[PDB]
């Protein structure tokens, strides 16, 4: 028989042991209210609880009120799999699908899209499969009502799951990451830069146990300054070496670019779909990157980092949404509070004057200071 | 043996049993005349006539001379497989390649896409097998000549069609949808709504007996009102069940968008090529999307539907084209005659000022009526 | 076992028999100079050096300075299997990327990108299998010094690479295409066309021994007239041949476009990342088309070719860039030198007022000719 085969002739074939399957919120009485009740403050709910074995593989929702009246930053989406009492998905919704913060703004990847109307039709195609059953739970951390929730949980039942089959984890972590203690010496300009040969203060987007791969990730930086943040190396540690065998050169060369870019971008597999759009790269960038033709496999454990700045000199408002597959459904760290994942003021012409102010004052007040001295 | 696989991985393994063939519209004295002999009105021609087992991966085609002079709404494409006398593919030209009425527009998706010159170049990447030959005919139903056909049909020739290779097929369909008795009540604006439990007077844009799946809506809505034409549900019955195991939301929702879209928007599954440009959503749009990750699988029958308005309450002058596989070449519903499927005048001010003059009536003629009343 | 397979359902599997590896120009000591050492001009350097069975599968570089400062036409890119002392991979690395002649621009198709800033981030998914270990060299030809080299090669080590694996090849050719005796005869607008039946003075883009498939090519025209550059077929003679059995009808159908097209497109599988931006179709225009749904299979071997105009009758200033896989790692032809590939002037207002001149003289020098005549 032929080997032949490839995505589009792979769909001509006629395909055994799959049954569709549909959990939504459309209305139960056939009216239009096609959209659960209200959800109150810190009200959670399962909204999708499955039975057996079976492989979710289009997930779509919306939200009303949208941002930044109701942000997604605030609403939490966990999955639960083969019966455990712990997430082996958890969290922000809006961070979930590729929208960062409290915004809204149109972008499409491969796996996680969110389109119109402005960013609020929010999409994912990874396939999560499970062999006892799968619950899907919001929570509403906002201080207001989730008005109107609206979903698709798509899904194929399976007689028999076959048998290499893993399970899809995903995780938000956040950081307010710390300065050195002589200053943010990025580029050498305000002191001497020093070696990173350990990734002792590295960023960490992923830490898990077990066997599978890593298959993406969302970038959400706030910087502070206009300096450019992305100097900052990917370091991996793959089965607990100690030497990490995967190391990068940049952040933006992490992210299939190049030079420093602030320019809206996108590809299948990466992109960046919102840009600073101030004086260097001050403000909000959010960038990703799919890895499903190049994953990052591990056998026992897997550690996935990054620098903030080089040498981890920058203080940034980092945060970040890991997606990865092993072998059974495991937990997670526990998640940062409402408090801790708030997003950040962007810093001003304000607040830029006064750091022009007592620098003038560390050069001793001068009456013509330009502000390149 | 690694089972390590992806679509980049699989491309760098050799392949058996496949020989390159094409048929085109190439010149046969090896001069510049790279297109057809014209078509006269009425005038049908088979194109390629392909014997034994194949698949058909690449089809390109151009049309002179372009839109609106010659309308791709009036030149059908028709395949039939394995020898038979129906066609198990059938639609007008342009709709069958992302082109809705007699329009022309840029747009990629991943089977299908409509190139420069301004939507010219039509490309499909759906993979079309066959076991006992393929017949793709042409028919002018212009009441114009076609002065020029070009094509490229590219399939690969196999000595054994591997067993579980299904047979594609497309069909067109065009309805003027019947507003409810009580009139167009969406979002009980003018009078009570009422629940659709049946889906009795839905849209049916597929129907078929057989075992496959379906793989794509191509989406062509004229709205005659400023109201948004999108409340309603997909509704999708498979193997003859009696309640419908898919229901969705919304017509955005289903087209993974949300909250009442009209901007434009590309994914390589789903997107909006066309939108309206108008007061609310008056005039035309088009939206697809492809089931490529994520088809609706049956193995006796499928019925796929979807509400036109919230319990199906307005008019709507709507087209589709749907895609799917089965397990043999079978027959459709007899096409939309030419007249049926005409494109419709767009509404405009002068229209517009007669619904106000009858709406004044309605009130009283008061001399100051504002139009918000 | 179901046999249900797609990208994203695949996955979803566990993997076995792989080991990510990575070789960078990450800074050795930890510090900050994550690049390579700068080569002077005509400086050779082997950057990777892999022992063994694997599989590369993502390619990142940028170059410093970029261009048009130094030009990534005269850095040249080469990749060596399986111990060979030929490549199999030859190219100016810019036009390998899909950047032609000394430019930079923003694009996106899958297994190729230059991506931001303003297509200096380069990156490849090609995969490239290997059995007896890789090497990849990087030549400076420029008469500067590449100042800062960054790169990021990920791969997978395997200990058993599956045993229908090919290897990947790609070869960039360059002519300043030979208009006919007769001169330019394009839509026999200054005299009459004539049959080409044979395909002996089509340019050639790829010719080879083996066994494998054609997956792409990256097309760059610089036309020195406004007439369009693309009525050429293209003409494939696959296993020796002596009639071609693929035969186009032109070069933007054979791109997936039509009617003379100008405008920026893209598709994951083909696009016009640069456009001529000018009268007609005069200056420089990037087409690419890969054929990864829809290879050109060979089992012997394999001749690729398209018309320079219709019966070659223009002159041409071409490159490109063609992409396969066959069994075994073999060699390539000789390279143009930098001499023979140097980007040509643009053609201006200068050059066609001395056209004009030599064109009144032709017809008689009447002191009032406008130019139609
Ligand atoms: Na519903
Ligand atoms: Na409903
Ligand atoms: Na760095
Ligand atoms: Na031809
Ligand atoms: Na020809
Ligand atoms: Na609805
Ligand atoms: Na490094
Ligand atoms: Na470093
Ligand atoms: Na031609």
Redesign the interface.
Known sequence: ??????????????????????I????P????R??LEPFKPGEKRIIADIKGMG?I??I?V?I?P?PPTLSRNDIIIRMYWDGNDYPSVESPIGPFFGQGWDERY?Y?S??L?A????G????C?????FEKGARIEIENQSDRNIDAF???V?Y?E?A?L?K???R?HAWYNHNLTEALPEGETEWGVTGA??????GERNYVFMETQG???F?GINYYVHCPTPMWYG?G?DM?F?DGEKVP??????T??FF????????A??????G?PRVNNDIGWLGRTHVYRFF??????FEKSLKGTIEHG??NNLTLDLSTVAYW?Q?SAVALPEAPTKAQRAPKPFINHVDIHRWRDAWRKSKGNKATLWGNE
Chains 1, 2, 3 share one sequence.
């Open positions: 028989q032929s080997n032949m085969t490839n995505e589009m002739f792979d769909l001509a074939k006629l395909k055994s042991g799959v049954k569709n399957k549909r939504s919120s459309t209305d009485t056939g009216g239009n096609d959209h492989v593989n289009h779509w919306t009303a949208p149109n499409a491969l796996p899209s389109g119109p109307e402005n609020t039709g929010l999409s195609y990874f396939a999560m499969p609206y979903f698709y798509d194929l399976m028999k076959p290499d089959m893993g899809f830069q020093k070696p990173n040969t350990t066997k599978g791969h298959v100097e190396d991996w793959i065998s995967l190391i990068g050169t940049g933006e060369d299939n670019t190049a030079w420093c870019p602030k320019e971008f996108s590809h299948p597999y990466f960046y499903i033709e190049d994953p990052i496999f080089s040498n597959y072998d």
